[model samples]
Target: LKKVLLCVGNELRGDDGVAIALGRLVEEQMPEWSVFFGYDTPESEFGKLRELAPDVIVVADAMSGEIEFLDLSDERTYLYPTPILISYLRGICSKTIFLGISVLLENVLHFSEGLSQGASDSAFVALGRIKELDGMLK
Candidate 1:
């Protein structure tokens, strides 16, 4: 199964910065993992994602709406990867383990003063999500 990594975010904000940075880190470390980094505009690449039809899709980006810190939603189904809700976050987190083979339905939230949310965290999050979905590959 082909598992693709999706990273989305604007580079200006500190928290939003993690997605692109994380992509670069993956480019540096895990060449085996196919990574695509975007600027958090989901509509532009929705078709590409659908075309790829990756078994496990991990979309990493900054989410902002409710939380003041970082937030994420890991889902097994296809879903938007930004401007997401905590309910969706809880929904996906419930089914997936961040462990084995699985499609990553993701939405990352960005907040203020959370620069400590680093790219390494993004890397780890992506890796963990990959593992989480690995067991339930479709």
Candidate 2:
């Protein structure tokens, strides 16, 4: 089955770049998975996603809560544009998963090119979790 990891984040915004960082790792480690960098404007990736037509799409983004995997049934608040983007993604892929990594509000509000220590740590955790999820999908 085809799997896609759609990483959504702004690499210039400190910890908000966690998903981009995670995307790099995924590209290096998960050769079988298709990775897309949605950056800040996730909606812009819609056309490409439609072309991919992946069986599963995992959306990873930075949020102001604990790191967790979420589905549509979850009620937690999502990062801006995510709620709208996910709805569109559902049209392109039947299964969509949200992987949220917690970030400090202060850290995400600044201009930076790299992740904070906390976000960096969370990237590894997300990587492990994604790998486990991939196994289950297989």
Candidate 3:
């Protein structure tokens, strides 16, 4: 199945950049999978997403919560793009998965580069989870 990993985050916004770091790792390690660095403007990548038409699109972002993976159909406050973008993604892909990396609320509120200790740790764990999902999906 064709799978795409859409990482959404702003590297300038401290811990909010966790997904970008994770995306880099995924790109380096999982060359078989399509990886897109949506950064803060995930909506801009919609056209490319449509062209790829992946079977599954995994949206990874940093949020002020626990690290967790949930179906896009599930009810939860997403920290990435707007509902319209989410709906658009759902329409274009058969399945959408959200990979949330926990970060400090204070860290994300400010303009700074790099991740906090907590967010760095969470990204490490999230990477393992992503690898597991990659294996399962394959």
Could you estimate the TM-score for every candidate?
A: 0.51, 0.90, 0.88
lDDT of model 2 at position 92: 77
TM-score of 1: 0.51
Model 2 stretches astray by more than 4 angstroms = 73-81
Go through the candidates in order and give each one's C-alpha lDDT: 0.47, 0.84, 0.83
Q: Whose lDDT is greatest here?
A: 2
Q: Best TM-score goes to which candidate?
A: 2
lDDT of 3 by residue, 27-98 (tens): 888887788998989988998998988988889988763677877754453343346766788889758887
lDDT of 1 by residue, 1-138 (tens): 665566666665555555566567666666656777656564465566657655545565544431111223334342433334224323433321121111122322433322453444554565554444445454
**Candidate 2 residue-wise lDDT, 47-98, digit = tens:** 8888878888999999863677865433353332377788788667667888
The per-candidate count of clashes, in order, stands at: 24, 0, 0
Model 1 spans with C-alpha error above 4 angstroms = 63-138
lDDT of 1: 0.47
What does the lDDT come to for candidate 2? Answer: 0.84
